[PDB]
């Protein structure tokens, strides 16, 4: 059973994702619909960059020609791999013309590259540093993090990350056998006490077999930056 929701993992993602690019074109009154038909003219993509890259690159603002469109991602392109990023086989025309895994692969090298790269540690993937961190903060708890998809499905270890941190956010004994309301939980209170947009859409989390493995690792890079010892 694998075709069916892999093509809802992709709906899911498309949705996270375009909450997450949303986050920070927000941060300057930006906003975007649909992540896979609002970078085809390069220029949120840019403005994206500009915010969580902190720099003023210039691009066409309002493109009329697909020349103008593509030559947008030659300047989106080549800022990310000066910032140490690694394209495996993305080019503007991939992005210009809509191509909906190769702008995911994209967005998700932003998010592993602005988001999550701190937990990299010369060995350690990204993705290894962060499952390891919520394990130790989850120690105390009865839940097993052993990945970022079937672990977070139940609402219990989202509120454990909170927890563990502000027990005045959330009262670990409320937290019950009703994924839902857990997950609602964790997302409101993570919207309201410590300024994180609702990443992830608790239908597709409670409706699907296992959520979206990278959805479920953005909302939890986004806790990650909240709790900063520094
Ligand atoms: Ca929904």
Redesign the pocket.
């Given at each position: 059973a694998d075709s069916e929701l892999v093509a809802q993992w992709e709906k899911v993602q498309i949705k996270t994702f375009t909450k997450w690019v949303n986050m920070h074109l927000a941060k300057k009154g930006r906003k975007i619909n649909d992540v896979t038909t609002d970078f085809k003219n390069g220029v949120e993509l840019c403005a994206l960059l500009e915010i969580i890259g902190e720099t003023t690159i210039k691009c066409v603002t309002n493109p009329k020609m697909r020349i103008q469109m593509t030559e947008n991602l030659d300047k989106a392109l080549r800022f990310i791999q000066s910032r140490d990023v690694k394209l495996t086989g993305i080019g503007p025309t991939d992005i210009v013309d809509g191509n909906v895994k190769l702008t995911l692969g994209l967005v998700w090298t932003l998010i592993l590259r602005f988001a999550i790269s701190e937990l990299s540690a010369e060995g350690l993937s990204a993705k290894q540093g962060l499952l390891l961190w919520c394990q130790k903060k989850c120690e105390p708890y009865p839940v097993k993090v052993e990945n970022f998809s079937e672990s977070f499905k139940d609402g219990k270890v989202f509120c454990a990350l909170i927890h563990r941190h502000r027990p005045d956010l959330l009262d670990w004994e409320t937290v019950g056998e009703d994924d839902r309301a857990n997950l609602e939980k964790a997302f409101d209170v993570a919207e309201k006490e410590l300024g994180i947009p609702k990443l992830l859409?608790?239908?597709?989390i409670v409706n699907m077999p296992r959520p979206d493995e990278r959805s479920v690792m953005t909302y939890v890079a986004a806790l990650y930056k909240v709790f900063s010892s520094n």
């Open positions: 859409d608790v239908d597709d």
